[model samples]
Target chain A: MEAVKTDRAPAAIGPYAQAVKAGGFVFVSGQIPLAPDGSLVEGDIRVQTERVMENLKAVLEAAGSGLSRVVQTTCFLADMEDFPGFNEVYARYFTPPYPARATVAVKALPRGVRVEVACVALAE
Target chain B: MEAVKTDRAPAAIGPYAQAVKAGGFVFVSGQIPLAPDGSLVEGDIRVQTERVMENLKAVLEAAGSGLSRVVQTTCFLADMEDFPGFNEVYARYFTPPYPARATVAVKALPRGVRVEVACVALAE
Candidate 1:
C-alpha cells in the first residue's frame, strides 16, 4: 500500500494517512468538517457535512479516484437526529447507483465534529 | 466489481449487499451481531463482537479472502465502554502486520447492538 496525500485537505490529526491506496483501491480516512487549513468548519449538520464531503473529494482525487468511483462509505454522526440533514448534502456528492453506505451515531467524533466519513473507492 | 452473496452470514438488513468486490478488494458491509438466519445473537459485547467478526469472516471468505487479508477495518461501536472487550476479541481475529483500523463509539447502532464492523480486504 502507498500513502496518498495532498495539501488540499487538512492534515490528519492522528498517525493515519489521509488515504492509503493498495490493490487497485483507495481507502480514505475518516474526514471530519476540518477545512484545508485544518480548522473545523462552523455550522449546522448540513454545512458541516458539505465540508466533510469536500475534504473527502480532495483526498479521493489525490488517490486518482473521484466520488463517482467510491464503492462504499461509512458515515459517523454525533446525532441520529441529524440523519436527514446529513443526507441532504451527502446525496448531492454522488450520482444514482450510489456507493453502498452505513450510517451510525457515535458517542463522539474527533474534534467534536457532528459528522465524519471514510470511504473505499476504485482507483482511477 | 461484483456483489458477494452468502447464506452463511446474516443478510444485509437494508439496501446493501452482503459485500461488494471491486478494484481487487472486497468491501464488506458493516456486520452486526445478527446470525445467518437474520436474528440478533443473544449476549454481551464479547459474544456480540465475536458474532460480528464471524459474520465478517463469512462474508470475506465468500469474497475469496479471509480476515488475514483485510487491509483495513472501520469499527462502529455504540459504546466506548466496550472498547477493551471489543479489542480483546478483535485482536484474536488477525495476525501481525495488522490491517489499519479506525475505531469510534457511535451514538447508537442498528438493532441496539454494541458494535458493528465494515472491512476492506485484498481479494484473492
Candidate 2:
C-alpha cells in the first residue's frame, strides 16, 4: 500500500490524500474544479468538468496510472439535468468500454463545483 | 486491465459499462430496477430492491465475481424511510463480514427507481 501525492494537483481541502494506492489499486479522492493554485475555476459546467478531469488525471498520473486504467468512478452532480452535457465531456476523456460509473445528482458539491469526480484505478 | 460487458444484464442506459475488471477486482456499475428488456419494474420498495439486486447479481456473475466477494458497496435511496426495507433485501444477497457500504438518500434515481446499487468485488 502506498499514498500518492503530488503538487501538480490541488491540495487536499479536507482530511484525505490526493490518492491512496492499496491492494494494487489507487482510490483517488474526489476532484473538484479547484486548480493547483486553490482557486475555483469560474465558468460553466463544461469548463468546470474539464478542470475536474484534469485534476483527476494528474492524481492518477502521480500514482503511476492513467484514466484509461480506471475501473470505476462515482460522479456527483449538482443537477441531473446536466447529465447530457456532462456525458459529452466525459466521453471525450474515457474511451469505449469506459470505466464502470455511478452518477448521481447530489444536493451539493465541495467548493460548489457543478460536478465532482472520484475514481478507483489500477496501480501498475 | 479489462472491461466486463455482459448481455445477461440490461444494456447501459447511459455512458457506462455494467462492470469493469482490473487488478483482481471487478467494479460493478449501479443497478436499478430495469429489466433485461428495459422495462421498469413496478411495485413498492421491496420488489424494486429485489430487481436491483438481481440485476447486480447478473453483472457480477458476468464479470466473474459474486456478491460474497464484494468489498464495498454504495447504495442510493430516493427516501431514507425505506432503509429498513432495503436492508432486508440487501442482507439476503450479502453475508456477514459484509462489504463496507455507504447509503445515502438522494433526490432521485435513474428512471425514477427507489433504490440503486453499485459495488466492488474481488475477481479471483
Candidate 3:
C-alpha cells in the first residue's frame, strides 16, 4: 500500500493520507471545498464542485492515476436541490462512459461544504 | 472489468451495474435498505443497516469475494442520529483490520432508505 499526499489539495484529516494506493487502485478520501491553502472556498455549489474535483485530481495524480481512470465515485451533497447545479460542474470534469456514480444529499459535512466526493481509480 | 449483478439486492438505480470487478478488486455500488425482492425494508436504522450489509455481501460473493475481503467502504446516512446504530451493525459484518472507510450523512437517498453503502473488496 502507498500513502498518496500532495501540496495541491486540502490537507489530510489526521491519521490518514489524502489517499491510499493499494490492490491496484487508488482509494481517495472525501474531498471538500477546501483549497490547498487550507481555506474553505466560500461560493455556490458550482464553484465548490470545481474545487472538490480539483482536489480529487491532485490526490489521484499523486497516487499514480488520474480522473480518467476513476471507475466509480460516491458523492455526498448537502442538499438535493443543488443536484442539477453540481452535475453541471461534475459533467465538465468527467468524460463520457463517465465513471459509475451514486449521489445523495447528506445532513452535514465537515467545514460545511455543499458537496464532497470520494472516488476509486485504477492505478497506472 | 466485470459487472456483478444479482437478484439478491436492490435494482441498479439506472445505467449502472450492482458492482464491477476490475484491477483485482470488486467495487460494489452503494447498497440501500431495499431488499432482494425489490421492496424497501421499512424498519429503523438497525434493520436498515443490516439489510444494506446483506445486500453488499450478496454482491461481493457474486463478484467472487466476500465481506472478509473488503478493502474499503463508503457509507451514506440520512441522519447523524443513526450513526451509532449504523456502526453497531457494520462492525459485525467485517472482521479486524477492517477495510478503510469514509462515512457521511447525505441529504437524501433513493426511495429514502436511511443508510446506504458501497465497498471495494480484494478479489479472491
The prediction achieving the highest DockQ against the true structure is 2
| Clash pairs detected, candidate 1 | A105-B106, A105-B107, A106-B106, A106-B107, A107-B105, A107-B106
Q: By the lDDT metric, which is better: model 1 or model 3?
A: 1
lDDT of 1 by residue, B1-124 (tens): 4778899998766545678878777888889999999988978789999999999999999989999999999898887899999999999997788999999877787777899898889888
Q: Write the per-residue lDDT of candidate 3 for residues A32-120, one digit (tens) a residue.
A: 99999998897899999999999999999888899878888888888878877888888888764466567888678887889999888
Error of 1 at B8 (Å): 4.2
Q: Rank the candidates by TM-score, best first.
A: 2, 1, 3
Steric clashes per prediction: 6, 0, 5
Positional deviation of residue B33's Cα in model 1 after best superposition, in angstroms: 1.7
**Candidate 3 segments exceeding 4 Å error:** A1-23, A34-43, A72-74, A87-92, A95-110, B6-8, B14-17, B35-39, B71-110
After aligning candidate 3 to the native by TM-score, how far in Å is the CA of A62 from where it should be? 5.1
Q: Which candidate number has the best TM-score?
A: 2
Tens-digit lDDT track of model 2 for B1-124: 6778777778898778899988778889999988888888988888999998999889998888888889999999988998999999998888987999999999777777898899989897
The models' CA-based lDDT, in order, is: 0.86, 0.88, 0.84
Candidate 2 docking DockQ: 0.72
- In terms of docking quality, how is candidate 3 classified? acceptable
Return the candidate ranking by DockQ, descending.
Answer: 2, 1, 3
Candidate maximizing lDDT:
2
TM-scores for candidates 1 onward, in order: 0.68, 0.93, 0.68
Error of 3 at A20 (Å): 5.1
